[PDB]
Amino acid sequence: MIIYRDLISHDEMFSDIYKIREIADGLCLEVEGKMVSITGVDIVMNHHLQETSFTKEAYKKYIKDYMKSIKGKLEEQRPERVKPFMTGAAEQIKHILANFKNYQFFIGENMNPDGMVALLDYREDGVTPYMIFFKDGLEMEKC
Amino acid sequence: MIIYRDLISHDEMFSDIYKIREIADGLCLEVEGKMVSITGVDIVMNHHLQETSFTKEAYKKYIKDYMKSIKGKLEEQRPERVKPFMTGAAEQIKHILANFKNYQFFIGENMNPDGMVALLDYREDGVTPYMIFFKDGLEMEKC
């Protein structure tokens, strides 16, 4: 099994028991969930993700801060990934802010305030959930 | 996370993301799943378990051979489990054969004809699925 952890907080975020597809040119992972019967998202239940909430202005403050943290990690492990990530994430942040109320927000079970914030959306059938993660803020652990 | 593997075919069978319970005096692990959306059992989908079928006669012959593979590995591992493994296992077979119709049967994704066969039943509420595994045929690795 492959487990994906938060690069900052080291929480487990999900694993390859779900369907995973890269999007936005390697910037993000889209993870397919399943609804299960408290009627919820298996990804969230399975990994004890905690739902959180932002005002738009606190997210803007948070996500710039988080982007700077990922820039730091990349600078010391993959310096070539820095300017694609900073470019791509800026493109992505401004779109996320547009649809801000279409997303729910989740953090790992450590509730580290410097951790990644995943976005939960639902497909148009209103039943299948999916979650968006910043791929550069994740670290794969085989076991 | 803890992954539970099939001692014989090395397939992944489940992980500790489910409620897991020891039953039958430490002979078996009972793993509680959730119904999930096609309608099925999260455990089965998450680890790509494969449903199989038996005649009672075929199951009888499969299961006694399975016990000899597990007796063998126990002889070299912990010979003090052989007495209570073959004891409970024999008692467990009679219970399964006596209620043969209430079960579905699942093997790891490699469909190894000699790997463990997990049983799928449902609770008195007829909605909650749970799967039965032979504990002595599992190895509990971490990450």
PDB file of C-alpha atoms in Angstrom:
ATOM      1  CA  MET A   1       0.000   0.000   0.000  1.00  0.00           C
ATOM      2  CA  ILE A   2       1.091   3.603  -0.653  1.00  0.00           C
ATOM      3  CA  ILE A   3       0.280   6.204   2.009  1.00  0.00           C
ATOM      4  CA  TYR A   4       0.326   9.958   1.333  1.00  0.00           C
ATOM      5  CA  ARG A   5       1.391  12.126   4.284  1.00  0.00           C
ATOM      6  CA  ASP A   6       1.341  15.861   4.863  1.00  0.00           C
ATOM      7  CA  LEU A   7       4.903  17.034   4.164  1.00  0.00           C
ATOM      8  CA  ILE A   8       4.599  19.643   6.960  1.00  0.00           C
ATOM      9  CA  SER A   9       2.570  17.854   9.671  1.00  0.00           C
ATOM     10  CA  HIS A  10       3.306  14.188   8.693  1.00  0.00           C
ATOM     11  CA  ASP A  11      -0.371  13.254   9.164  1.00  0.00           C
ATOM     12  CA  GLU A  12      -1.575  10.479   6.909  1.00  0.00           C
ATOM     13  CA  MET A  13      -3.933  12.114   4.418  1.00  0.00           C
ATOM     14  CA  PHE A  14      -5.033   9.202   2.183  1.00  0.00           C
ATOM     15  CA  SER A  15      -3.674   6.069   0.517  1.00  0.00           C
ATOM     16  CA  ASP A  16      -3.859   4.335  -2.868  1.00  0.00           C
ATOM     17  CA  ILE A  17      -7.007   2.380  -1.894  1.00  0.00           C
ATOM     18  CA  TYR A  18      -8.813   5.259  -3.664  1.00  0.00           C
ATOM     19  CA  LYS A  19      -8.714   6.308  -7.298  1.00  0.00           C
ATOM     20  CA  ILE A  20      -6.054   9.005  -7.721  1.00  0.00           C
ATOM     21  CA  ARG A  21      -5.469  11.212 -10.769  1.00  0.00           C
ATOM     22  CA  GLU A  22      -3.008  14.052 -11.313  1.00  0.00           C
ATOM     23  CA  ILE A  23      -4.504  17.339 -12.531  1.00  0.00           C
ATOM     24  CA  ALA A  24      -3.460  20.939 -13.285  1.00  0.00           C
ATOM     25  CA  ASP A  25      -0.220  19.752 -14.869  1.00  0.00           C
ATOM     26  CA  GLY A  26       1.186  17.799 -11.934  1.00  0.00           C
ATOM     27  CA  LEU A  27       0.208  20.396  -9.342  1.00  0.00           C
ATOM     28  CA  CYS A  28      -2.560  18.496  -7.556  1.00  0.00           C
ATOM     29  CA  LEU A  29      -3.937  15.061  -6.835  1.00  0.00           C
ATOM     30  CA  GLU A  30      -7.668  14.470  -7.222  1.00  0.00           C
ATOM     31  CA  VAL A  31      -8.813  11.622  -4.950  1.00  0.00           C
ATOM     32  CA  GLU A  32     -12.100   9.826  -5.556  1.00  0.00           C
ATOM     33  CA  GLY A  33     -14.007   9.015  -2.391  1.00  0.00           C
ATOM     34  CA  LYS A  34     -17.114   7.012  -1.696  1.00  0.00           C
ATOM     35  CA  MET A  35     -20.155   7.899   0.369  1.00  0.00           C
ATOM     36  CA  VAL A  36     -20.675   5.465   3.229  1.00  0.00           C
ATOM     37  CA  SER A  37     -23.281   5.120   5.952  1.00  0.00           C
ATOM     38  CA  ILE A  38     -22.573   8.936  10.005  1.00  0.00           C
ATOM     39  CA  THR A  39     -23.379   9.360   6.238  1.00  0.00           C
ATOM     40  CA  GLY A  40     -19.987  10.688   5.149  1.00  0.00           C
ATOM     41  CA  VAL A  41     -16.861  10.572   3.016  1.00  0.00           C
ATOM     42  CA  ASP A  42     -14.772   7.438   3.470  1.00  0.00           C
ATOM     43  CA  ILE A  43     -11.503   9.371   2.930  1.00  0.00           C
ATOM     44  CA  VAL A  44     -12.358  11.693   5.806  1.00  0.00           C
ATOM     45  CA  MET A  45     -13.513   8.942   8.157  1.00  0.00           C
ATOM     46  CA  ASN A  46     -10.711   6.510   7.286  1.00  0.00           C
ATOM     47  CA  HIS A  47      -7.928   8.985   8.057  1.00  0.00           C
ATOM     48  CA  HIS A  48      -9.656  11.016  10.807  1.00  0.00           C
ATOM     49  CA  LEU A  49      -9.409  14.217   8.798  1.00  0.00           C
ATOM     50  CA  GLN A  50     -10.870  17.106  10.781  1.00  0.00           C
ATOM     51  CA  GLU A  51     -13.168  19.538   9.018  1.00  0.00           C
ATOM     52  CA  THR A  52     -12.199  23.207   9.413  1.00  0.00           C
ATOM     53  CA  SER A  53     -13.500  26.550   8.134  1.00  0.00           C
ATOM     54  CA  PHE A  54     -11.975  29.763   6.807  1.00  0.00           C
ATOM     55  CA  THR A  55     -13.079  33.273   6.177  1.00  0.00           C
ATOM     56  CA  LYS A  56     -11.834  34.236   2.702  1.00  0.00           C
ATOM     57  CA  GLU A  57      -9.257  36.578   4.214  1.00  0.00           C
ATOM     58  CA  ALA A  58      -7.898  33.987   6.642  1.00  0.00           C
ATOM     59  CA  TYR A  59      -7.532  31.460   3.810  1.00  0.00           C
ATOM     60  CA  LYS A  60      -5.650  34.052   1.724  1.00  0.00           C
ATOM     61  CA  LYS A  61      -3.394  34.617   4.711  1.00  0.00           C
ATOM     62  CA  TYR A  62      -3.131  30.869   5.351  1.00  0.00           C
ATOM     63  CA  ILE A  63      -2.482  29.779   1.779  1.00  0.00           C
ATOM     64  CA  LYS A  64       0.244  32.376   1.126  1.00  0.00           C
ATOM     65  CA  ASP A  65       1.855  31.210   4.363  1.00  0.00           C
ATOM     66  CA  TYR A  66       1.458  27.532   3.354  1.00  0.00           C
ATOM     67  CA  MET A  67       2.850  28.196  -0.138  1.00  0.00           C
ATOM     68  CA  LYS A  68       5.910  29.788   1.471  1.00  0.00           C
ATOM     69  CA  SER A  69       6.378  26.672   3.623  1.00  0.00           C
ATOM     70  CA  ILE A  70       6.172  24.355   0.583  1.00  0.00           C
ATOM     71  CA  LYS A  71       8.578  26.675  -1.265  1.00  0.00           C
ATOM     72  CA  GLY A  72      10.952  26.164   1.661  1.00  0.00           C
ATOM     73  CA  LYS A  73      10.687  22.368   1.492  1.00  0.00           C
ATOM     74  CA  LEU A  74      11.176  22.350  -2.266  1.00  0.00           C
ATOM     75  CA  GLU A  75      14.158  24.724  -1.997  1.00  0.00           C
ATOM     76  CA  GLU A  76      15.946  22.083   0.083  1.00  0.00           C
ATOM     77  CA  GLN A  77      14.878  18.952  -1.790  1.00  0.00           C
ATOM     78  CA  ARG A  78      13.814  19.938  -5.336  1.00  0.00           C
ATOM     79  CA  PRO A  79      14.938  23.493  -6.150  1.00  0.00           C
ATOM     80  CA  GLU A  80      13.811  23.062  -9.779  1.00  0.00           C
ATOM     81  CA  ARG A  81      10.200  22.556  -8.654  1.00  0.00           C
ATOM     82  CA  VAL A  82      10.018  25.987  -6.970  1.00  0.00           C
ATOM     83  CA  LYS A  83       9.008  28.259  -9.780  1.00  0.00           C
ATOM     84  CA  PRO A  84       6.500  25.833 -11.417  1.00  0.00           C
ATOM     85  CA  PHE A  85       4.852  25.343  -8.001  1.00  0.00           C
ATOM     86  CA  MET A  86       4.761  29.064  -7.204  1.00  0.00           C
ATOM     87  CA  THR A  87       3.415  29.776 -10.692  1.00  0.00           C
ATOM     88  CA  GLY A  88       0.911  26.924 -10.628  1.00  0.00           C
ATOM     89  CA  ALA A  89      -0.305  27.456  -7.082  1.00  0.00           C
ATOM     90  CA  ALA A  90      -0.925  31.162  -7.742  1.00  0.00           C
ATOM     91  CA  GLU A  91      -3.068  30.197 -10.738  1.00  0.00           C
ATOM     92  CA  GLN A  92      -4.823  27.656  -8.491  1.00  0.00           C
ATOM     93  CA  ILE A  93      -5.313  29.889  -5.418  1.00  0.00           C
ATOM     94  CA  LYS A  94      -7.181  32.527  -7.412  1.00  0.00           C
ATOM     95  CA  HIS A  95      -9.560  29.935  -8.846  1.00  0.00           C
ATOM     96  CA  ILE A  96     -10.189  28.308  -5.453  1.00  0.00           C
ATOM     97  CA  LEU A  97     -11.036  31.726  -4.007  1.00  0.00           C
ATOM     98  CA  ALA A  98     -13.655  32.218  -6.729  1.00  0.00           C
ATOM     99  CA  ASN A  99     -15.554  29.017  -5.806  1.00  0.00           C
ATOM    100  CA  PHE A 100     -14.820  29.473  -2.100  1.00  0.00           C
ATOM    101  CA  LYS A 101     -18.218  28.345  -0.828  1.00  0.00           C
ATOM    102  CA  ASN A 102     -18.350  25.275  -3.079  1.00  0.00           C
ATOM    103  CA  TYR A 103     -15.561  23.644  -1.036  1.00  0.00           C
ATOM    104  CA  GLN A 104     -15.372  22.172   2.393  1.00  0.00           C
ATOM    105  CA  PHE A 105     -11.976  22.212   4.100  1.00  0.00           C
ATOM    106  CA  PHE A 106     -10.148  19.401   5.909  1.00  0.00           C
ATOM    107  CA  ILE A 107      -6.858  19.105   7.802  1.00  0.00           C
ATOM    108  CA  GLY A 108      -5.025  16.063   9.107  1.00  0.00           C
ATOM    109  CA  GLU A 109      -5.818  14.622  12.496  1.00  0.00           C
ATOM    110  CA  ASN A 110      -2.880  16.412  14.154  1.00  0.00           C
ATOM    111  CA  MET A 111      -4.652  19.709  13.358  1.00  0.00           C
ATOM    112  CA  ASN A 112      -1.271  21.310  12.754  1.00  0.00           C
ATOM    113  CA  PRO A 113      -2.029  24.923  11.714  1.00  0.00           C
ATOM    114  CA  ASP A 114       0.863  24.769   9.220  1.00  0.00           C
ATOM    115  CA  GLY A 115      -0.535  21.637   7.576  1.00  0.00           C
ATOM    116  CA  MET A 116      -2.171  21.259   4.207  1.00  0.00           C
ATOM    117  CA  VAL A 117      -5.873  22.048   3.833  1.00  0.00           C
ATOM    118  CA  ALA A 118      -7.651  19.641   1.526  1.00  0.00           C
ATOM    119  CA  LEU A 119     -10.728  20.660  -0.409  1.00  0.00           C
ATOM    120  CA  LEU A 120     -13.788  18.399  -0.524  1.00  0.00           C
ATOM    121  CA  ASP A 121     -16.163  18.675  -3.456  1.00  0.00           C
ATOM    122  CA  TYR A 122     -19.029  16.572  -4.805  1.00  0.00           C
ATOM    123  CA  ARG A 123     -19.567  15.466  -8.374  1.00  0.00           C
ATOM    124  CA  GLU A 124     -22.660  16.673 -10.158  1.00  0.00           C
ATOM    125  CA  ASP A 125     -24.678  13.543  -9.297  1.00  0.00           C
ATOM    126  CA  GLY A 126     -24.490  14.986  -5.757  1.00  0.00           C
ATOM    127  CA  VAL A 127     -23.278  11.632  -4.348  1.00  0.00           C
ATOM    128  CA  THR A 128     -19.651  10.875  -5.277  1.00  0.00           C
ATOM    129  CA  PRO A 129     -17.154  12.953  -3.244  1.00  0.00           C
ATOM    130  CA  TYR A 130     -13.668  13.929  -4.316  1.00  0.00           C
ATOM    131  CA  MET A 131     -10.834  15.757  -2.588  1.00  0.00           C
ATOM    132  CA  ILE A 132      -8.078  18.008  -3.947  1.00  0.00           C
ATOM    133  CA  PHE A 133      -4.572  17.984  -2.492  1.00  0.00           C
ATOM    134  CA  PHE A 134      -1.447  19.943  -3.359  1.00  0.00           C
ATOM    135  CA  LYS A 135       0.866  17.251  -4.666  1.00  0.00           C
ATOM    136  CA  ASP A 136       4.018  19.128  -3.613  1.00  0.00           C
ATOM    137  CA  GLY A 137       2.731  19.179  -0.021  1.00  0.00           C
ATOM    138  CA  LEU A 138       2.475  15.343   0.109  1.00  0.00           C
ATOM    139  CA  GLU A 139       5.091  12.651   0.768  1.00  0.00           C
ATOM    140  CA  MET A 140       4.592   9.000  -0.338  1.00  0.00           C
ATOM    141  CA  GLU A 141       5.498   6.285   2.152  1.00  0.00           C
ATOM    142  CA  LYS A 142       5.523   2.723   0.795  1.00  0.00           C
ATOM    143  CA  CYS A 143       4.925  -0.076   3.279  1.00  0.00           C
TER     144      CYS A 143
ATOM    145  CA  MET B   1      -1.161   2.410   9.693  1.00  0.00           C
ATOM    146  CA  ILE B   2      -0.999  -1.389  10.034  1.00  0.00           C
ATOM    147  CA  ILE B   3      -1.464  -3.587   6.960  1.00  0.00           C
ATOM    148  CA  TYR B   4      -2.667  -7.178   7.424  1.00  0.00           C
ATOM    149  CA  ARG B   5      -1.296  -9.582   4.826  1.00  0.00           C
ATOM    150  CA  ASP B   6      -2.043 -13.151   3.784  1.00  0.00           C
ATOM    151  CA  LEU B   7       0.783 -15.347   5.130  1.00  0.00           C
ATOM    152  CA  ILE B   8       0.499 -17.594   2.095  1.00  0.00           C
ATOM    153  CA  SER B   9      -0.112 -15.487  -1.026  1.00  0.00           C
ATOM    154  CA  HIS B  10       1.147 -12.220   0.578  1.00  0.00           C
ATOM    155  CA  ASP B  11      -1.945 -10.337  -0.636  1.00  0.00           C
ATOM    156  CA  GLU B  12      -3.027  -7.317   1.381  1.00  0.00           C
ATOM    157  CA  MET B  13      -6.293  -8.201   3.086  1.00  0.00           C
ATOM    158  CA  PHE B  14      -7.200  -5.173   5.219  1.00  0.00           C
ATOM    159  CA  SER B  15      -5.690  -2.445   7.364  1.00  0.00           C
ATOM    160  CA  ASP B  16      -6.422  -0.925  10.728  1.00  0.00           C
ATOM    161  CA  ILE B  17      -8.614   1.789   9.213  1.00  0.00           C
ATOM    162  CA  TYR B  18     -11.574  -0.463  10.089  1.00  0.00           C
ATOM    163  CA  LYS B  19     -12.894  -1.528  13.444  1.00  0.00           C
ATOM    164  CA  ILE B  20     -11.068  -4.834  14.153  1.00  0.00           C
ATOM    165  CA  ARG B  21     -12.035  -7.308  16.892  1.00  0.00           C
ATOM    166  CA  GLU B  22     -10.488 -10.566  18.111  1.00  0.00           C
ATOM    167  CA  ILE B  23     -12.978 -13.431  18.274  1.00  0.00           C
ATOM    168  CA  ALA B  24     -13.065 -17.208  18.784  1.00  0.00           C
ATOM    169  CA  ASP B  25     -10.415 -17.199  21.545  1.00  0.00           C
ATOM    170  CA  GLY B  26      -7.818 -15.497  19.380  1.00  0.00           C
ATOM    171  CA  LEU B  27      -8.362 -17.720  16.353  1.00  0.00           C
ATOM    172  CA  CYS B  28      -9.921 -15.006  14.191  1.00  0.00           C
ATOM    173  CA  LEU B  29      -9.984 -11.299  13.427  1.00  0.00           C
ATOM    174  CA  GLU B  30     -13.393  -9.747  12.803  1.00  0.00           C
ATOM    175  CA  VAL B  31     -13.171  -6.649  10.578  1.00  0.00           C
ATOM    176  CA  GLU B  32     -16.209  -4.366  10.456  1.00  0.00           C
ATOM    177  CA  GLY B  33     -16.745  -2.673   7.106  1.00  0.00           C
ATOM    178  CA  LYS B  34     -19.232  -0.142   5.831  1.00  0.00           C
ATOM    179  CA  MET B  35     -21.663  -0.418   2.951  1.00  0.00           C
ATOM    180  CA  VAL B  36     -20.458   1.811   0.153  1.00  0.00           C
ATOM    181  CA  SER B  37     -21.589   3.102  -3.252  1.00  0.00           C
ATOM    182  CA  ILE B  38     -22.764  -0.250  -7.460  1.00  0.00           C
ATOM    183  CA  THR B  39     -23.291  -1.301  -3.816  1.00  0.00           C
ATOM    184  CA  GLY B  40     -20.652  -3.250  -1.924  1.00  0.00           C
ATOM    185  CA  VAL B  41     -18.319  -3.539   1.060  1.00  0.00           C
ATOM    186  CA  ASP B  42     -15.539  -0.969   1.514  1.00  0.00           C
ATOM    187  CA  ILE B  43     -13.081  -3.623   2.796  1.00  0.00           C
ATOM    188  CA  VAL B  44     -13.507  -5.620  -0.394  1.00  0.00           C
ATOM    189  CA  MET B  45     -13.127  -2.646  -2.723  1.00  0.00           C
ATOM    190  CA  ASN B  46     -10.328  -0.939  -0.800  1.00  0.00           C
ATOM    191  CA  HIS B  47      -8.065  -3.975  -1.075  1.00  0.00           C
ATOM    192  CA  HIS B  48      -9.376  -5.413  -4.350  1.00  0.00           C
ATOM    193  CA  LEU B  49     -10.535  -8.642  -2.726  1.00  0.00           C
ATOM    194  CA  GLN B  50     -12.050 -11.157  -5.141  1.00  0.00           C
ATOM    195  CA  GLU B  51     -15.301 -12.948  -4.404  1.00  0.00           C
ATOM    196  CA  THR B  52     -15.204 -16.690  -4.957  1.00  0.00           C
ATOM    197  CA  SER B  53     -17.627 -19.583  -4.449  1.00  0.00           C
ATOM    198  CA  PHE B  54     -17.452 -23.156  -3.225  1.00  0.00           C
ATOM    199  CA  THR B  55     -19.488 -26.240  -3.053  1.00  0.00           C
ATOM    200  CA  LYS B  56     -19.569 -27.554   0.513  1.00  0.00           C
ATOM    201  CA  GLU B  57     -17.445 -30.485  -0.639  1.00  0.00           C
ATOM    202  CA  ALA B  58     -14.945 -28.204  -2.386  1.00  0.00           C
ATOM    203  CA  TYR B  59     -14.801 -25.971   0.675  1.00  0.00           C
ATOM    204  CA  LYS B  60     -14.239 -28.961   2.951  1.00  0.00           C
ATOM    205  CA  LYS B  61     -11.264 -30.035   0.845  1.00  0.00           C
ATOM    206  CA  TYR B  62      -9.924 -26.497   0.450  1.00  0.00           C
ATOM    207  CA  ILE B  63     -10.097 -25.714   4.145  1.00  0.00           C
ATOM    208  CA  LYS B  64      -8.349 -28.818   5.460  1.00  0.00           C
ATOM    209  CA  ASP B  65      -5.483 -28.181   3.056  1.00  0.00           C
ATOM    210  CA  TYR B  66      -5.398 -24.525   4.097  1.00  0.00           C
ATOM    211  CA  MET B  67      -5.000 -25.663   7.719  1.00  0.00           C
ATOM    212  CA  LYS B  68      -2.003 -27.839   6.765  1.00  0.00           C
ATOM    213  CA  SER B  69      -0.258 -24.898   5.099  1.00  0.00           C
ATOM    214  CA  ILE B  70      -0.875 -22.847   8.250  1.00  0.00           C
ATOM    215  CA  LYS B  71       0.053 -25.711  10.579  1.00  0.00           C
ATOM    216  CA  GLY B  72       3.328 -26.030   8.670  1.00  0.00           C
ATOM    217  CA  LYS B  73       4.239 -22.363   8.972  1.00  0.00           C
ATOM    218  CA  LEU B  74       3.246 -22.437  12.655  1.00  0.00           C
ATOM    219  CA  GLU B  75       5.559 -25.413  13.314  1.00  0.00           C
ATOM    220  CA  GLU B  76       8.585 -23.282  12.390  1.00  0.00           C
ATOM    221  CA  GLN B  77       7.242 -19.986  13.776  1.00  0.00           C
ATOM    222  CA  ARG B  78       5.479 -20.657  17.083  1.00  0.00           C
ATOM    223  CA  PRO B  79       4.739 -24.362  17.612  1.00  0.00           C
ATOM    224  CA  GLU B  80       2.763 -23.494  20.743  1.00  0.00           C
ATOM    225  CA  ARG B  81      -0.040 -22.099  18.526  1.00  0.00           C
ATOM    226  CA  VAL B  82      -0.478 -25.383  16.619  1.00  0.00           C
ATOM    227  CA  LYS B  83      -2.552 -26.939  19.411  1.00  0.00           C
ATOM    228  CA  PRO B  84      -5.095 -24.059  19.710  1.00  0.00           C
ATOM    229  CA  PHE B  85      -4.999 -23.282  15.961  1.00  0.00           C
ATOM    230  CA  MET B  86      -6.008 -26.758  14.749  1.00  0.00           C
ATOM    231  CA  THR B  87      -8.395 -27.009  17.718  1.00  0.00           C
ATOM    232  CA  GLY B  88     -10.385 -23.851  17.013  1.00  0.00           C
ATOM    233  CA  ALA B  89     -10.002 -24.191  13.243  1.00  0.00           C
ATOM    234  CA  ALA B  90     -11.672 -27.618  13.305  1.00  0.00           C
ATOM    235  CA  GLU B  91     -14.414 -26.172  15.500  1.00  0.00           C
ATOM    236  CA  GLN B  92     -14.603 -23.160  13.183  1.00  0.00           C
ATOM    237  CA  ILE B  93     -15.010 -25.319  10.059  1.00  0.00           C
ATOM    238  CA  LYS B  94     -18.023 -27.110  11.522  1.00  0.00           C
ATOM    239  CA  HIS B  95     -19.654 -23.772  12.274  1.00  0.00           C
ATOM    240  CA  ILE B  96     -18.998 -22.508   8.748  1.00  0.00           C
ATOM    241  CA  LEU B  97     -20.210 -25.724   7.126  1.00  0.00           C
ATOM    242  CA  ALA B  98     -23.355 -25.674   9.285  1.00  0.00           C
ATOM    243  CA  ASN B  99     -24.188 -22.112   8.147  1.00  0.00           C
ATOM    244  CA  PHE B 100     -22.546 -22.361   4.728  1.00  0.00           C
ATOM    245  CA  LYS B 101     -25.301 -20.434   2.952  1.00  0.00           C
ATOM    246  CA  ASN B 102     -25.005 -17.249   5.063  1.00  0.00           C
ATOM    247  CA  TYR B 103     -21.493 -16.527   3.785  1.00  0.00           C
ATOM    248  CA  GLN B 104     -19.692 -15.035   0.870  1.00  0.00           C
ATOM    249  CA  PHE B 105     -16.066 -15.873   0.238  1.00  0.00           C
ATOM    250  CA  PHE B 106     -13.222 -13.561  -0.713  1.00  0.00           C
ATOM    251  CA  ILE B 107      -9.577 -14.062  -1.582  1.00  0.00           C
ATOM    252  CA  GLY B 108      -6.786 -11.563  -2.091  1.00  0.00           C
ATOM    253  CA  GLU B 109      -6.462  -9.891  -5.449  1.00  0.00           C
ATOM    254  CA  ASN B 110      -3.997 -12.452  -6.857  1.00  0.00           C
ATOM    255  CA  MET B 111      -6.771 -15.105  -6.660  1.00  0.00           C
ATOM    256  CA  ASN B 112      -4.295 -17.684  -5.304  1.00  0.00           C
ATOM    257  CA  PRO B 113      -6.269 -20.971  -4.935  1.00  0.00           C
ATOM    258  CA  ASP B 114      -4.365 -21.734  -1.676  1.00  0.00           C
ATOM    259  CA  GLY B 115      -4.494 -18.320  -0.025  1.00  0.00           C
ATOM    260  CA  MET B 116      -6.792 -17.494   2.856  1.00  0.00           C
ATOM    261  CA  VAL B 117     -10.511 -17.277   2.213  1.00  0.00           C
ATOM    262  CA  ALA B 118     -12.174 -14.509   4.214  1.00  0.00           C
ATOM    263  CA  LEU B 119     -15.844 -14.834   5.043  1.00  0.00           C
ATOM    264  CA  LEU B 120     -18.359 -12.033   4.571  1.00  0.00           C
ATOM    265  CA  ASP B 121     -21.451 -11.966   6.797  1.00  0.00           C
ATOM    266  CA  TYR B 122     -23.851  -9.255   7.951  1.00  0.00           C
ATOM    267  CA  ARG B 123     -24.974  -8.351  11.466  1.00  0.00           C
ATOM    268  CA  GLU B 124     -28.394  -8.902  13.025  1.00  0.00           C
ATOM    269  CA  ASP B 125     -29.261  -5.476  11.588  1.00  0.00           C
ATOM    270  CA  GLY B 126     -28.692  -7.113   8.165  1.00  0.00           C
ATOM    271  CA  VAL B 127     -26.936  -3.954   6.989  1.00  0.00           C
ATOM    272  CA  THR B 128     -23.525  -3.875   8.676  1.00  0.00           C
ATOM    273  CA  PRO B 129     -20.961  -6.088   6.902  1.00  0.00           C
ATOM    274  CA  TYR B 130     -18.124  -7.794   8.732  1.00  0.00           C
ATOM    275  CA  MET B 131     -15.382 -10.086   7.497  1.00  0.00           C
ATOM    276  CA  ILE B 132     -13.772 -13.011   9.303  1.00  0.00           C
ATOM    277  CA  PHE B 133     -10.067 -13.771   8.891  1.00  0.00           C
ATOM    278  CA  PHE B 134      -7.901 -16.557  10.308  1.00  0.00           C
ATOM    279  CA  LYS B 135      -5.541 -14.579  12.531  1.00  0.00           C
ATOM    280  CA  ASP B 136      -2.750 -17.194  12.365  1.00  0.00           C
ATOM    281  CA  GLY B 137      -2.735 -16.835   8.573  1.00  0.00           C
ATOM    282  CA  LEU B 138      -2.027 -13.090   8.804  1.00  0.00           C
ATOM    283  CA  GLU B 139       1.087 -10.992   9.380  1.00  0.00           C
ATOM    284  CA  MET B 140       0.721  -7.480  10.857  1.00  0.00           C
ATOM    285  CA  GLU B 141       3.285  -5.132   9.286  1.00  0.00           C
ATOM    286  CA  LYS B 142       3.521  -1.393   9.999  1.00  0.00           C
ATOM    287  CA  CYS B 143       4.660   1.613   7.956  1.00  0.00           C
TER     288      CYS B 143
END
